[PDB]
Amino acid sequence: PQITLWKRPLVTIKIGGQLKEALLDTGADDTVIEEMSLPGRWKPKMIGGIGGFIKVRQYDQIIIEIAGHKAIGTVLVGPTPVNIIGRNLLTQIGATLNF
Amino acid sequence: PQITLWKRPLVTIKIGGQLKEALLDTGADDTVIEEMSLPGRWKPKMIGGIGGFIKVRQYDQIIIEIAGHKAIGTVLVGPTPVNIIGRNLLTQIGATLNF
Ligand SMILES: COc1ccc(S(=O)(=O)N(CC(C)C)C[C@@H](O)[C@H](Cc2ccccc2)NC(=O)c2cccc(C(=O)N3CCC[C@@H]3c3nc(C)cs3)c2)cc1
Ligand SMILES: [Cl-]
Ligand SMILES: [Cl-]
Numbered sequence: 001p002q003i004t005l006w007k008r009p010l011v012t013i014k015i016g017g018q019l020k021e022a023l024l025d026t027g028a029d030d031t032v033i034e035e036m037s038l039p040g041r042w043k044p045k046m047i048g049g050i051g052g053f054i055k056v057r058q059y060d061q062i063i064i065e066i067a068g069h070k071a072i073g074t075v076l077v078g079p080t081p082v083n084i085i086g087r088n089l090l091t092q093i094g095a096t097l098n099f
Numbered sequence: 100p101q102i103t104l105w106k107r108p109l110v111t112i113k114i115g116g117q118l119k120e121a122l123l124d125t126g127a128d129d130t131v132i133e134e135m136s137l138p139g140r141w142k143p144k145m146i147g148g149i150g151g152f153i154k155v156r157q158y159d160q161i162i163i164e165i166a167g168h169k170a171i172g173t174v175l176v177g178p179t180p181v182n183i184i185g186r187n188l189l190t191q192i193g194a195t196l197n198f
């Protein structure tokens with residue numbers, strides 16, 4: 001699809017068996033989801049943005065379905081105010097910015 | 100152009116006669132630039148990023164070139180980890196996300 005930027009680019013994702021709304025975010029290196037449980041191992045990480053840093057859990061090899069397209073990669077889980085799909089998964093669904 | 104997302108989507112901007120680097124950021128409603136001098140009056144604004152809220156200075160109707168495209172609109176000045184071009188100016192340069 002071609003997604004307009006007149007509005008926030010929100011899409012439905014499926015992760016861990018759960019449906020969520022998430023922001024397609026070209027400014028995010030990594031994908032960051034609000035607190036939830038995910039299977040398998042994880043390790044702690046700090047990520048920073050406006051306002052400073054938060055601590056997250058890094059899970060590798062997690063499958064997400066993003067607006068109907070499956071992708072696999074690392075997902076960070078922690079107290080983000082918004083679910084963010086970052087470039088590590090946008091690339092896998094072939095997302096580009098066009099102007 | 101068509102910009103893939105394997106690398107950060109960094110572009111050159113020109114504001115106040117100065118070239119700077121900035122990140123095209125579909126997850127930001129607003130454009131936020133590091134401390135600099137801009138003309139005119141400013142208004143207060145709070146923005147809530149991943150780590151908390153910051154205060155910024157809001158300047159309206161500022162001339163800014165983005166990747167060679169002319170925009171005139173609101174620029175927020177404050178402590179951001181990188182200069183970010185948000186949707187208020189991505190719409191002015193005609194950007195869309197596509198997959
Ligand atoms: C390493 O992986 C990382 C992943 C994400 C980040 S980040 O979330 O901090 N971020 C990085 C840039 C600052 C370099 C991504 C950026 O797109 C964030 C995404 C983000 C959206 C909403 C809340 C928290 C994070 N936006 C803003 O900072 C930002 C800047 C200026 C204005 C706004 C804005 O429009 N917001 C703030 C709250 C309300 C409104 C929005 N709500 C939503 C739902 C979308 S935008 C966001 C950092 C590291
Ligand atoms: Cl990854
Ligand atoms: Cl590609």
Ligand SMILES: [Cl-]
Binds near residue numbers: 171172173187188
């Ligand atoms: Cl504007």
Ligand code: NA
Binds near residue numbers: 041
């Ligand atoms: Na894993």
